[PDB]
Design an enzyme around this catalytic site. Structure first.
Site, PDB file in Angstrom:
ATOM      1  N   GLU B  15       0.820  -1.198   0.000  1.00  0.00           N
ATOM      2  CA  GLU B  15       0.000   0.000   0.000  1.00  0.00           C
ATOM      3  C   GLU B  15       0.862   1.260   0.000  1.00  0.00           C
ATOM      4  O   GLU B  15       0.331   2.334   0.245  1.00  0.00           O
ATOM      5  CB  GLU B  15      -0.917  -0.008   1.227  1.00  0.00           C
ATOM      6  CG  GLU B  15      -1.868  -1.185   1.227  1.00  0.00           C
ATOM      7  CD  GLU B  15      -2.774  -1.152   2.421  1.00  0.00           C
ATOM      8  OE1 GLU B  15      -2.387  -1.698   3.478  1.00  0.00           O
ATOM      9  OE2 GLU B  15      -3.917  -0.580   2.322  1.00  0.00           O
ATOM     10  N   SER B 150      -6.238  -2.543   1.053  1.00  0.00           N
ATOM     11  CA  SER B 150      -6.372  -2.045  -0.330  1.00  0.00           C
ATOM     12  C   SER B 150      -6.790  -3.167  -1.325  1.00  0.00           C
ATOM     13  O   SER B 150      -6.485  -3.089  -2.533  1.00  0.00           O
ATOM     14  CB  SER B 150      -5.076  -1.383  -0.782  1.00  0.00           C
ATOM     15  OG  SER B 150      -4.816  -0.171  -0.095  1.00  0.00           O
ATOM     16  N   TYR B 216      -8.797   3.302  -6.000  1.00  0.00           N
ATOM     17  CA  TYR B 216      -7.854   4.419  -6.142  1.00  0.00           C
ATOM     18  C   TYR B 216      -7.727   5.039  -7.527  1.00  0.00           C
ATOM     19  O   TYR B 216      -7.080   6.073  -7.647  1.00  0.00           O
ATOM     20  CB  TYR B 216      -6.432   3.998  -5.696  1.00  0.00           C
ATOM     21  CG  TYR B 216      -6.452   3.385  -4.297  1.00  0.00           C
ATOM     22  CD1 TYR B 216      -6.855   4.155  -3.195  1.00  0.00           C
ATOM     23  CD2 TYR B 216      -6.119   2.032  -4.091  1.00  0.00           C
ATOM     24  CE1 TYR B 216      -6.902   3.596  -1.925  1.00  0.00           C
ATOM     25  CE2 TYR B 216      -6.166   1.475  -2.819  1.00  0.00           C
ATOM     26  CZ  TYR B 216      -6.534   2.273  -1.744  1.00  0.00           C
ATOM     27  OH  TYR B 216      -6.598   1.734  -0.456  1.00  0.00           O
ATOM     28  N   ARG B 255     -11.658   3.421  10.520  1.00  0.00           N
ATOM     29  CA  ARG B 255     -12.769   3.204   9.620  1.00  0.00           C
ATOM     30  C   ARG B 255     -13.095   1.733   9.555  1.00  0.00           C
ATOM     31  O   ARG B 255     -12.173   0.904   9.376  1.00  0.00           O
ATOM     32  CB  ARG B 255     -12.404   3.722   8.226  1.00  0.00           C
ATOM     33  CG  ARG B 255     -13.608   4.000   7.349  1.00  0.00           C
ATOM     34  CD  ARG B 255     -13.246   4.164   5.857  1.00  0.00           C
ATOM     35  NE  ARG B 255     -12.988   2.859   5.284  1.00  0.00           N
ATOM     36  CZ  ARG B 255     -11.796   2.435   4.880  1.00  0.00           C
ATOM     37  NH1 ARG B 255     -10.708   3.215   4.968  1.00  0.00           N
ATOM     38  NH2 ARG B 255     -11.696   1.200   4.428  1.00  0.00           N
ATOM     39  N   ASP B 257     -15.274  -1.398   7.748  1.00  0.00           N
ATOM     40  CA  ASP B 257     -15.917  -1.806   6.473  1.00  0.00           C
ATOM     41  C   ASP B 257     -16.982  -2.860   6.793  1.00  0.00           C
ATOM     42  O   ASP B 257     -16.699  -3.805   7.564  1.00  0.00           O
ATOM     43  CB  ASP B 257     -14.858  -2.406   5.555  1.00  0.00           C
ATOM     44  CG  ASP B 257     -13.832  -1.391   5.101  1.00  0.00           C
ATOM     45  OD1 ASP B 257     -14.088  -0.163   5.202  1.00  0.00           O
ATOM     46  OD2 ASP B 257     -12.719  -1.793   4.635  1.00  0.00           O
ATOM     47  N   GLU B 270     -13.905  -5.756   8.486  1.00  0.00           N
ATOM     48  CA  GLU B 270     -12.577  -5.472   9.063  1.00  0.00           C
ATOM     49  C   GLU B 270     -12.575  -4.059   9.588  1.00  0.00           C
ATOM     50  O   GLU B 270     -13.418  -3.260   9.213  1.00  0.00           O
ATOM     51  CB  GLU B 270     -11.447  -5.594   7.995  1.00  0.00           C
ATOM     52  CG  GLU B 270     -11.610  -4.634   6.789  1.00  0.00           C
ATOM     53  CD  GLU B 270     -10.289  -4.056   6.278  1.00  0.00           C
ATOM     54  OE1 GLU B 270      -9.154  -4.356   6.785  1.00  0.00           O
ATOM     55  OE2 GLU B 270     -10.403  -3.236   5.295  1.00  0.00           O
ATOM     56  N   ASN B 272      -9.880  -0.685  10.006  1.00  0.00           N
ATOM     57  CA  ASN B 272      -8.632  -0.090   9.520  1.00  0.00           C
ATOM     58  C   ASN B 272      -8.246   1.055  10.468  1.00  0.00           C
ATOM     59  O   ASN B 272      -9.032   1.990  10.655  1.00  0.00           O
ATOM     60  CB  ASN B 272      -8.813   0.428   8.074  1.00  0.00           C
ATOM     61  CG  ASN B 272      -9.192  -0.680   7.096  1.00  0.00           C
ATOM     62  OD1 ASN B 272      -8.379  -1.524   6.774  1.00  0.00           O
ATOM     63  ND2 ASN B 272     -10.455  -0.692   6.672  1.00  0.00           N
ATOM     64  N   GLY B 276      -6.919   5.230   4.624  1.00  0.00           N
ATOM     65  CA  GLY B 276      -6.503   6.134   3.542  1.00  0.00           C
ATOM     66  C   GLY B 276      -7.001   7.566   3.670  1.00  0.00           C
ATOM     67  O   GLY B 276      -8.097   7.838   4.204  1.00  0.00           O
TER      68      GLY B 276
HETATM   69  N1  LIG Z   1     -17.152 -11.747   2.277  1.00  0.00           N
HETATM   70  C1  LIG Z   1     -17.165 -10.864   1.261  1.00  0.00           C
HETATM   71  N2  LIG Z   1     -18.139 -10.892   0.297  1.00  0.00           N
HETATM   72  C2  LIG Z   1     -18.145  -9.970  -0.694  1.00  0.00           C
HETATM   73  N3  LIG Z   1     -17.224  -9.027  -0.880  1.00  0.00           N
HETATM   74  C3  LIG Z   1     -16.192  -8.913   0.024  1.00  0.00           C
HETATM   75  C4  LIG Z   1     -16.156  -9.813   1.179  1.00  0.00           C
HETATM   76  N4  LIG Z   1     -15.031  -9.476   1.857  1.00  0.00           N
HETATM   77  C5  LIG Z   1     -14.444  -8.430   1.245  1.00  0.00           C
HETATM   78  N5  LIG Z   1     -15.174  -8.084   0.147  1.00  0.00           N
HETATM   79  C6  LIG Z   1     -14.829  -7.017  -0.839  1.00  0.00           C
HETATM   80  O1  LIG Z   1     -13.389  -6.914  -0.872  1.00  0.00           O
HETATM   81  C7  LIG Z   1     -12.992  -5.594  -0.428  1.00  0.00           C
HETATM   82  C8  LIG Z   1     -11.766  -5.603   0.473  1.00  0.00           C
HETATM   83  O2  LIG Z   1     -12.040  -6.464   1.599  1.00  0.00           O
HETATM   84  P1  LIG Z   1     -11.663  -6.018   3.140  1.00  0.00           P
HETATM   85  O3  LIG Z   1     -12.127  -7.192   3.944  1.00  0.00           O
HETATM   86  O4  LIG Z   1     -12.184  -4.622   3.363  1.00  0.00           O
HETATM   87  O5  LIG Z   1     -10.041  -6.007   3.086  1.00  0.00           O
HETATM   88  P2  LIG Z   1      -9.019  -4.834   2.695  1.00  0.00           P
HETATM   89  O6  LIG Z   1      -8.204  -4.566   3.983  1.00  0.00           O
HETATM   90  O7  LIG Z   1      -8.117  -5.326   1.601  1.00  0.00           O
HETATM   91  O8  LIG Z   1      -9.852  -3.648   2.313  1.00  0.00           O
HETATM   92  C9  LIG Z   1     -14.243  -5.036   0.280  1.00  0.00           C
HETATM   93  O9  LIG Z   1     -14.272  -3.595   0.318  1.00  0.00           O
HETATM   94  C10 LIG Z   1     -15.400  -5.670  -0.493  1.00  0.00           C
HETATM   95  O10 LIG Z   1     -15.688  -4.978  -1.737  1.00  0.00           O
HETATM   96 MG   LIG Z   2      -8.242  -2.975   5.240  1.00  0.00          MG
HETATM   97 MG   LIG Z   3     -11.396  -2.804   3.492  1.00  0.00          MG
HETATM   98 MG   LIG Z   4      -7.992   9.873  -9.523  1.00  0.00          MG
END
Ligand SMILES: Nc1ncnc2c1ncn2[C@@H]1O[C@H](COP(=O)(O)OP(=O)(O)O)[C@@H](O)[C@H]1O
Ligand SMILES: [Mg+2]
Ligand SMILES: [Mg+2]
Ligand SMILES: [Mg+2]
Ligand SMILES: Nc1ncnc2c1ncn2[C@@H]1O[C@H](COP(=O)(O)OP(=O)(O)O)[C@@H](O)[C@H]1O
Ligand SMILES: [Mg+2]
Ligand SMILES: [Mg+2]
Ligand SMILES: [Mg+2]
EC number: 6.3.2.4
Lengths: 306, 306
Positions: B15, B150, B216, B255, B257, B270, B272, B276
């Protein structure tokens, strides 16, 4: 020149005096094993200077916050010095009994019923919901700071009106505390060394629980190693502790405390990632039953470092 | 003389480019707010030297392990410099998606059904039992490294026989991997600033998930803030996020998610702890809608530090 090893001991936690005794034994043990080791007390020496001081590797014989809780580990990672025991996450997690319990419960592992309280929750007055949850535990209960060791700040509550006294004591030592259902015992502890689970020890205090006096000052505490369990139960206990250890992400070596309750099931109390290493501490006692002298034990712990 | 602030940015993770952008934004915001701030990239500058360099406080704008996972936090704790965001334990836990999931499950919070695998397990080959557990998740599933950000290392698996390839990829990025039930969406995120939960954002990527390009590099992602939820539902989301935040022990800002699934319920993905701060980033959007300038946001994050 061969590697120079810093044995970090003492520090500034409530367990300082225990750590001075652990480091005194580890220092002599390492020198007996041919290791060029020196004592360094972070209360008196700035540990950010270890690399400047000529050290190559660190044996952590500190106990409690500031040595056992991930902070020192993060500094050593960034300094680039290998060190004994668990890394940043697992050290921080194992120090926090509240989050260790949540993690274990999330993994389906057995933990005593409990209520957690923050300082703000207690000192601003317990809610009705919290009072109900506490009442559901029954009496007696035990009260502990979340982030102590050596039974510091801990007490048994035998009367409802005295819970407040137990809570005031625990809040002298941390900002977060646990009230836990009293477990009947008997009490055990299980050391981990690399991939090896060491023989369990049954611990029988003479008084109410395995408190600071019973741990370090009494000639009346009884220990049984081997613990006298039927073979299948020793195996069950060892497998429970292995799963508890791997769930936390711990590495190198450590010691997990466990109690039976009157339902015949084992319950996990906590994990310790820098266990006591006084001559008479529990990790040396289990290692002795698995064929290791104290020096052999500390040389093995050091060999496991990164 | 006023405090001299180091804005840590760049570093060495996947990242890094996002972080260079986040740090460039933070630096301008702080200076716009009258703060004496300077950029420092740990890839170029030995961070164990910050206090020696005359810095008084640190704004962390790094993303990913070694800026976000507690290691840097521990070093700063021992150097004696105040810093922004969560402490050692909560940073480490928030980077570890596997252990965040277990902690949240232990606290009775909603998380997508999952299976975790270690690298050793994958290298041995999967047992009939592990395959059985994975199969119980249904399809599709998402495969993710435990400790990335990311959307690095992640893939959507829509056939049972595609799982091995997804694991082969995710294991390039971590030693622990999650296989999670695929959630229907829609997708949300919630910023925390101090004691305040900001109004949520609904995120609508144009592709298969909110991938690195969607995060991004695309002008096609849509964002809704306010999120269009019924008042009670927005309130539900905020309350869930607050519980998830406090369970991990996070502080300062961050933040979380979250996604809806096809049962109409929210599930935590998760947390964070160094989010960002780029022109495409989510915390700045929540702050803007909440009536703060970006400069006020970063001054506030800094004021909250230790
Ligand atoms: N169980 C899931 N089902 C559907 N989409 C997922 C799921 N887990 C993650 N995602 C998608 O993948 C992206 C990144 O996952 P996340 O768990 O937020 O890890 P990162 O730290 O890489 O952001 C999410 O913003 C979402 O769009
Ligand atoms: Mg993350
Ligand atoms: Mg995420
Ligand atoms: Mg741009
Ligand atoms: N729920 C409980 N019921 C009865 N005794 C307990 C309970 N929890 C802890 N103890 C006793 O208190 C001692 C210290 O508790 P522990 O959780 O191991 O904290 P510490 O880090 O201070 O050792 C134990 O060794 C055991 O004797
Ligand atoms: Mg302990
Ligand atoms: Mg104990
Ligand atoms: Mg193939």
């Amino acid at each position: 020149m061969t590697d120079k090893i810093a044995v970090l001991l003492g520090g500034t936690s409530a367990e300082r005096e225990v750590s001075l005794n652990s480091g005194a034994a580890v220092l002599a043990g390492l020198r007996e094993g041919g290791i060029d080791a020196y004592p360094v007390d972070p209360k008196e020496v700035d540990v950010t200077q270890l690399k400047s001081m000529g050290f190559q590797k660190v044996f952590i014989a500190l106990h409690g916050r500031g040595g056992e809780d991930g902070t020192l580990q993060g500094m050593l990672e960034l300094m680039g010095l290998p060190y004994t025991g668990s890394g940043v996450m697992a050290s921080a997690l194992s120090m926090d009994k509240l989050r260790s319990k949540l993690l274990w419960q999330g993994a389906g592992l057995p933990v005593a019923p409990w209520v957690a309280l923050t300082r703000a929750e207690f000192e601003k007055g317990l809610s009705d919901k919290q009072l109900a949850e506490i009442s559901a535990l029954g009496l007696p209960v035990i009260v502990k700071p979340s982030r102590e060791g050596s039974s510091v700040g801990m007490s048994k509550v035998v009367a409802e009106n005295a819970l407040q006294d137990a809570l005031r004591l625990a809040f002298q030592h941390d900002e977060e505390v646990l009230i836990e259902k009293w477990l009947s015992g008997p009490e055990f502890t299980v050391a981990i060394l690399g991939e090896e689970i060491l023989p369990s020890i049954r611990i029988q205090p003479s008084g109410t629980f395995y408190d600071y006096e019973a741990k370090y000052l009494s000639d009346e505490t009884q220990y049984f190693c081997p613990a006298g369990l039927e073979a299948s139960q020793e195996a069950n206990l060892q497998a429970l502790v292995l799963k508890a250890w791997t769930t936390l992400g711990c590495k190198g070596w450590g010691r997990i405390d466990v109690m039976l309750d009157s339902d015949g099931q084992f319950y996990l109390l906590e994990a310790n990632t820098s266990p006591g290493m006084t001559s008479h501490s529990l990790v040396p006692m289990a290692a002795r039953q698995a064929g290791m002298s104290f020096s052999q034990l500390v040389v093995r712990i050091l060999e496991l470092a990164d």
